[PDB]
Nucleic acid binder design. Sequence first.
RNA 1: GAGUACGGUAGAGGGUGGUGGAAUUUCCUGUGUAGCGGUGAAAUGCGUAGAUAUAGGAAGGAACACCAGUGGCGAAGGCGACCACCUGGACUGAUACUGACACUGAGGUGCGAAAGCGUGGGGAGCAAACAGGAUUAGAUACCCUGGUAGUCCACGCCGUAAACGAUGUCGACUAGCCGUUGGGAUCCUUGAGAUCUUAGUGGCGCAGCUAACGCGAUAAGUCGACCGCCUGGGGAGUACGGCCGCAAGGUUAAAACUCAAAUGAAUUGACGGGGGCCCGCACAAGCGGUGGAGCAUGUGGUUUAAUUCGAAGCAACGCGAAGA
Lengths: 153, 55, 118
Amino acid sequence: PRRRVAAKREVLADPKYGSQILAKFMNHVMESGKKAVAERIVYGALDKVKERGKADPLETFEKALDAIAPLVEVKSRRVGGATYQVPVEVRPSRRNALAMRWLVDFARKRGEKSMALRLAGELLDAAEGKGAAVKKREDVHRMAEANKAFSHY
Amino acid sequence: PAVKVKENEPFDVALRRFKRSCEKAGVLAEVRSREFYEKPTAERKRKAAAAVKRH
Amino acid sequence: VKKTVVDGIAHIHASFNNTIVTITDRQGNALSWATSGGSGFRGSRKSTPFAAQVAAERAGQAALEYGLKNLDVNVKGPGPGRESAVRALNACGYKIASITDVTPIPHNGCRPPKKRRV
RNA sequence: GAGUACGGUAGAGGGUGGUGGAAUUUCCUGUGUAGCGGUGAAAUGCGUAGAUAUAGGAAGGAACACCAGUGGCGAAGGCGACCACCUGGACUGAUACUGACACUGAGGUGCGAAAGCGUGGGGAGCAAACAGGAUUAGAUACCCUGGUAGUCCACGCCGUAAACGAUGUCGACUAGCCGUUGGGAUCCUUGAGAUCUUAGUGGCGCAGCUAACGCGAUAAGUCGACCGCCUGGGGAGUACGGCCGCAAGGUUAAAACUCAAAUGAAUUGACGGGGGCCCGCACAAGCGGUGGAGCAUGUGGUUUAAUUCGAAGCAACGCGAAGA
């Protein structure tokens, strides 16, 4: 058991778009602390999104994450000597973070040339709601709505 | 164990009155006690502890 | 066919393992019935209040084809779903005239089985 | 002291017959359609020949929900639906009567839970045995599905229980406090409480006792009458004989041998698939890994002439060695 309040880390806004929402997306796509390398990916990705349709690469990011962020999720829970996967709502602080999770993870496993156009490829592919990250969202939503029997916390 | 729904009230408060009638009659406790057969030694031992706690 | 019955009676045979909802007339002639085990809930999910309301809601819409709008609720037996099945009857079109517990109470009659030594 | 006569009170005290309600099961009929039942989950099982559910009817057996209460009655074992009949005791008030007629009690005799046994009935539920399904390495079990004796009744037998308050019966005395049952007396005649007293039934508690735990007017305190019983543990409440029993068995009841302890209470610690509270990358959420591949190192094993010696779970294995 713990008594700690953990820690409240703050993220500074991105320098090219003035949106802290991209800052945690940058914070998510990180590998080995290479800040400069990864930010070259998103801006190149956002240029690809902007160059292919749309009007602003920042607003389709907003459109992308809601289609990825689930509204409910189960967790392993033991009450009566057995595991009951009680579906629980996802808090606003976690839904966007896990939205940033599933965009990079499934785009990393795509077959496109480089991540620069691979996260970009998923960005519009997820904004319209027909991508694998969108697919992963609904099966989690499929995991719930079937275990609805267990609703005690 | 029997309630009548009146005019112009929500059915929700009709439910809450219903179980309030149920625990007043204590039907759930009665069926729980008759689920299995409690031997006279176990029944008298339970009632002796009930008297001790009451005092 | 359509019996065209306006007044009915709903019976919920809630048990510790299953909940059987049966809609009947004032003379005890059944029209529709559904069970928690018949609604895709098997095992640990059959004994859950959510499975009870699914059974009640499934039999609820099957009972409107007779043109039933009034019914009395006769819940019987203990278990998770004695009330959750009744709340399902409110979601679909119905008004409940009365709710009654008809759980049988022996007056110290037949000997029950022995304690389970689990 | 013990007892009798009278009025009254409470009671699951006992026996003999009726009667009632709830519920279970079985059967008949109507509606109605894919499950019911069960479990941790399943399966055996029941069900399309129509189950479960629901409604109406019928049969049968057993126990009497609520009242219900360290409440009541009984020598104890025990006794819970209602009513009628037969019947024992206790408590209570005064007066009247006998006048020690009392207590205990080896033998003896009577009653004595449940199981069990015999003859005859009865059989709804439950359920030894038995059968099947699970679980398990196995499971002659726990769990599930069925299910026979039995449980019920009458008449006999048995005669044993942790038959316990693990405390024989009877009588007297010894601070109090708080409940409760059946009475009685006085203030309250109160409408409605209070104070004494008695027979029970409980909880604390002075003294006293106790190895301690605890008992403490319902004594395990202070005494008195009588009775039963004990003399280390195992062997053994066994063998043998006697008595009893239809039997199962009961009762009375040893020795050889063997051990130096068995035992009671309480304390500290430790432990618990006991409980309560709290913490730690212990768990949860994630970041990246090992285990798959090639190379470096150490260890075990093997081999050698030696493969020098030590380190061996966490807390040894890139350790002594910060460098054959």
